[PDB]
RNA sequence: AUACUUACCUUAAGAUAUCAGAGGAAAGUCCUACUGAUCAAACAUGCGCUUCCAAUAGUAGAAGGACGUUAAGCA
């Protein structure tokens, strides 16, 4: 795929125009033949088109082993302190307090292979 | 702490209520647990003296702030 996606944007440049080029531009799917071959070049399963729920959230700092992490659901990390001066802090809330000993490992490996 | 060593200093004067009257050491000085009058201070003590001292029968209000917010207010 890394071949098929280099030639192509050697044979695309070389070979075609402005203008037939900003006609294969629709920006309903991003797609764009100069610059998506470079973007998804390694990634196979490259789309462009409550994010804690995900796994990539989960497993953030360590891969295979995921682990819920306890957040405070009202943040003010990204408020300024010019803006939170003019009305009084709610109380934090919070999630996962109760997980924060407990993380999980899908163990593939010792399960279908030692294990068999 | 003692002691020893050095280094730096070792000074503006004067006064303690006023005025008047009697006495003592002709002018003035000094003094009187002397005597009047005024003044000032302290301490007691009074004036039919003058001003001021916050809801609970209610969820308030008065005085003064903010080097507080709305706020890149409006012109």
Same mark, same amino acid.
């Given at each position: 795929?890394?071949? /098929?996606?280099?030639?192509?944007? +050697?044979?695309?440049? +070389?070979?075609?125009? &402005? $203008?037939?080029?900003?006609?294969? /531009?629709?920006?309903?799917?991003?797609?764009?033949?100069?610059?998506?071959?470079?973007?998804?070049?390694?990634? =196979?399963?490259?789309?462009? $088109?409550?994010?804690?729920?995900?796994?990539?959230?989960?497993?953030?700092?360590? /891969?295979?082993?995921? +682990?819920?992490?306890? !957040?405070?659901?009202?943040? &003010?990390?990204?408020?300024?302190?010019?803006?939170?001066? !003019?009305?009084? /802090?709610?109380? =934090?809330?919070?999630?996962?307090?109760?997980? &924060?000993? !407990? $993380?999980? &490992?899908?163990?593939?490996?010792?399960?279908?292979?030692?294990?068999?």
């Amino acid at each position: 795929m890394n071949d /098929i996606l280099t030639d192509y944007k +050697t044979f695309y440049l +070389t070979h075609s125009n &402005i $203008v037939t080029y900003e006609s294969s /531009i629709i920006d309903s799917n991003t797609f764009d033949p100069i610059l998506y071959p470079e973007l998804k070049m390694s990634n =196979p399963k490259y789309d462009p $088109v409550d994010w804690h729920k995900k796994t990539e959230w989960k497993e953030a700092g360590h /891969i295979g082993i995921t +682990t819920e992490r306890p !957040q405070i659901s009202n943040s &003010i990390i990204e408020c300024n302190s010019g803006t939170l001066i !003019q009305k009084p /802090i709610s109380l =934090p809330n919070f999630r996962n307090l109760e997980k &924060i000993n !407990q $993380v999980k &490992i899908n163990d593939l490996y010792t399960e279908e292979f030692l294990k068999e």
